[PDB]
Design a protein around this ligand. Structure first.
Ligand SMILES: *[C@@H]1O[C@H](CO)[C@@H](O)[C@H](O)[C@H]1NC(C)=O
Ligand SMILES: *[C@@H]1O[C@H](CO)[C@@H](O)[C@H](O)[C@H]1NC(C)=O
Ligand SMILES: *[C@@H]1O[C@H](CO)[C@@H](O)[C@H](O)[C@H]1NC(C)=O
Lengths: 98, 9, 275, 277
């Protein structure tokens, strides 16, 4: 049993009022069954697409969830992930500098 | 192309 | 060259929650180009890269048949694993397989691979000679004597020497403009105060292909190897990659630090300085 | 939509036990059940199952086509879409049919076999069922001919996944979910592609009334166990000094031997060369 590493980031340099893509990249986890949601202002964004399940040479799985967004500084974006190794759902907030 | 070789455990 | 083709199989049992699931994905280098999911209505091998989409009907038919057979085989393999390890039929278990070939500059075979794991641990692997096996435990040993009896290694060797390499060459040809033309990283350094005596210098590389890249921080020519925050390489989402490397620096010495970037899309290695 | 499943088997005998589980939103928690036509009319007068519905002992009343709905508050009706159908078939309601393999139960890998299910009783349908947890039976209409009803199930191309023990059941017209008693089991075995062993005799194939004759099955492959078969036995293998694995069967008829590995009873090697005693 391995616990997921999470990254939340944009596809392009974040600029307010411009089209972009938001990515929750999860990896290093095992088993495969995992829950991933992209949150805006605390609530799920529908129209969330994800890549097909693959894994690394250490047999740990990885997945990319992503949505189309427009960054503003009023709105807050995050990623919520639940997994069997997690007692409680982990939330990672999007920071333009990470 | 994927392998056509059966790997029965 | 050099290039690689890999196939990734995942087979999962999940009693009460669904029927056994088979997922397969194909990679050339860091680019996924095909996928199969047995949980679809009418499961088919599907394209994931635009340069394979113009392959004909014959290709998708063949691959879909092959994949359905593989799905059946690996479901039964989950049953067999249950008997091997004397586990209950109520638990959720996973078989993973990765196999494929590496070729060089001229397309000649460099390496063959075929590894299998059960519940995240190494189960059985094809040796470099492509004619023997290595088993990690007694169950895996049963599988080994089975495969030796069935002469699996020879058929596998046949696939790796012929079909795998030829199709890899054809693929490298289909998408040359995206697979064989390396995309250099767009690079820049950012500054982020921590204390009033400390500050983080972050070296950014964005939109590069392929995924392998070197980001180092040097303090007057010395590699801050064990005091660098090196985040895992991540996908941008458009088949390119992102990476950064942070170093924490005493304020007032930002000048003494340089970021060195090496990537095959770069004619010469880069050195960046924050300003 | 929820995922409905029956444990350990959807095909269940009278007096047996079967549990229906409804998995919805990562919970087996709160669901209602329905039969095949009263689709929006929940059974047991709309009873809510706070737990997986355990049926034990199983009666013919339980037989039927089930769907489940999960409790989904803040939602168009407060209930999910219908789940996957799951048919509970109760067996042991009629005289068992006969099942036979053509040409035989030993089936070469990649080849095909016909499992024929027939009966004195005019069964409307036949079901072919492989012994195993979480398995679906195959249905065929019964052809009526010369006072017997029959059905030819085709199995192939033969792989390990299709090997195992098979039973056929019959069902009459007005009780489609009530099946007969199981037929006598048929062990379908796939042979190959494991290399064939050598067969010999000690002291030889020519034997008269007085003395002993032992058949020796030998191979360089690490077969865990050898099977001796006569036209129309099982022994563990021992590793010999010349690195051959061998079994010795102490005993006319024509014999062949099949190698096999542990935890894999339904897959044998290619047959040895025939040896007549
Ligand atoms: C089970 O019910 C569904 C819909 O309620 C129907 O489509 C299906 O044919 C039924 N199965 C059988 C075996 O009658
Ligand atoms: C059904 O199976 C056996 C042998 O194949 C026999 O009863 C009969 O020839 C078959 N009927 C067919 C193939 O229509
Ligand atoms: C292995 O040794 C046995 C003696 O028990 C002998 O009968 C058999 O022929 C040998 N096998 C081979 C392949 O030489």
């Amino acid at each position: 049993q391995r616990t997921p590493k999470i990254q939340v980031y944009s596809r392009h340099p974040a600029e307010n009022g411009k089209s972009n893509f938001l990515n929750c990249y999860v990896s290093g986890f095992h088993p495969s069954d995992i829950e991933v949601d992209l949150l805006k202002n605390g609530e799920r964004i529908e129209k969330v697409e994800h890549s097909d399940l693959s894994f690394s040479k250490d047999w740990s799985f990885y997945l990319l969830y992503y949505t189309e967004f427009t960054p503003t500084e009023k709105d807050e974006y995050a990623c919520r992930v639940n997994h069997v190794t997690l007692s409680q759902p982990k939330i990672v907030k999007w920071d333009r500098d990470m | 192309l994927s392998s056509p070789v059966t790997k029965s455990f | 060259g050099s290039h690689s083709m890999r196939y990734f199989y995942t087979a999962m049992s999940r009693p009460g929650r669904g029927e056994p699931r088979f997922i397969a994905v194909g990679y050339v280098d860091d680019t996924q180009f095909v996928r199969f999911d047995s949980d679809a209505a009418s499961p088919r091998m599907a394209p994931r890269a635009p340069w394979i989409e113009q392959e004909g009907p014959e290709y998708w038919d063949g691959e879909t048949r092959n994949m359905k057979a593989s799905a059946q085989t690996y479901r039964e393999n989950l049953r067999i694993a249950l008997r091997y390890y004397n586990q209950s039929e109520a638990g959720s278990h996973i078989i993973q397989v990765m196999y494929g070939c590496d070729v060089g500059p001229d397309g000649r075979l460099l390496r063959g691979h075929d590894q299998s794991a059960y519940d995240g641990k190494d189960y059985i692997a094809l040796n470099e000679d492509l004619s023997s096996w290595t088993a990690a435990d007694t169950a895996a040993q049963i599988t080994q004597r089975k495969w030796e009896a069935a002469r699996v290694a020879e058929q596998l060797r046949a696939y790796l020497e012929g079909l795998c390499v030829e199709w890899l060459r054809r693929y490298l040809e289909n998408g040359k403009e995206t697979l064989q033309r390396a995309d250099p990283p767009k690079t820049h350094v950012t500054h982020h105060p921590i204390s009033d005596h400390e500050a983080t210098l972050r070296c950014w590389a964005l939109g590069f292909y392929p995924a392998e890249i070197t980001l180092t921080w040097q303090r007057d020519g010395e590699d801050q190897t064990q005091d660098t925050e090196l985040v895992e390489t991540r996908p941008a989402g458009d088949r390119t990659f992102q990476k950064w490397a942070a170093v924490v620096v005493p304020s007032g010495e930002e000048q003494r630090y340089t970021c060195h970037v090496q990537h095959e899309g770069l004619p010469k290695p880069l050195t960046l300085r924050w300003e | 939509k929820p995922f409905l499943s029956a444990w350990p088997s959807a095909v269940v005998p009278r007096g047996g036990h079967v549990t229906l589980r409804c998995h919805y939103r990562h919970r087996f928690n709160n669901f209602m059940l329905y039969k095949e036509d009263r689709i929006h009319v929940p059974i047991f007068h709309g009873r809510l199952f706070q737990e997986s519905f355990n049926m034990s002992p199983v009666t013919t009343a339980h037989a039927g086509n089930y769907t489940c709905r999960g409790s989904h508050p803040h939602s168009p009706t407060g209930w999910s879409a219908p789940s996957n159908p799951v048919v509970i078939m109760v067996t042991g309601n009629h005289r068992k049919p006969s099942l036979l393999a053509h040409p035989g139960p030993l089936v070469k890998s990649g080849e095909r076999v016909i499992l024929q299910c027939w009966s004195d009783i005019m069964f409307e349908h036949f079901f072919l069922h492989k012994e195993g947890i979480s398995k679906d039976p195959s249905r065929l209409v019964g052809q009526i001919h010369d006072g017997v009803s029959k059905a030819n199930f085709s199995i192939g191309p033969m792989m390990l996944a299709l090997a195992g023990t098979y039973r056929c059941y019959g069902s009459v017209t007005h009780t489609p979910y009530q099946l007969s008693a199981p037929s006598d089991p048929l062990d379908i075995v796939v042979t190959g592609p494991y290399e064939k062993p050598s067969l010999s005799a000690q002291p030889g194939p020519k034997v008269q009334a007085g003395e002993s004759v032992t058949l020796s099955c030998s191979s360089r492959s690490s077969y865990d166990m050898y099977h001796l078969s006569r036209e129309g036995r099982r022994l563990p293998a021992v590793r010999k000094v010349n690195r051959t694995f061998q079994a010795d069967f102490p005993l006319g008829g024509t014999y062949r031997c099949f190698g096999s590995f542990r935890h894999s009873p339904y897959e044998w090697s290619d047959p040895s060369d025939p040896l007549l005693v």
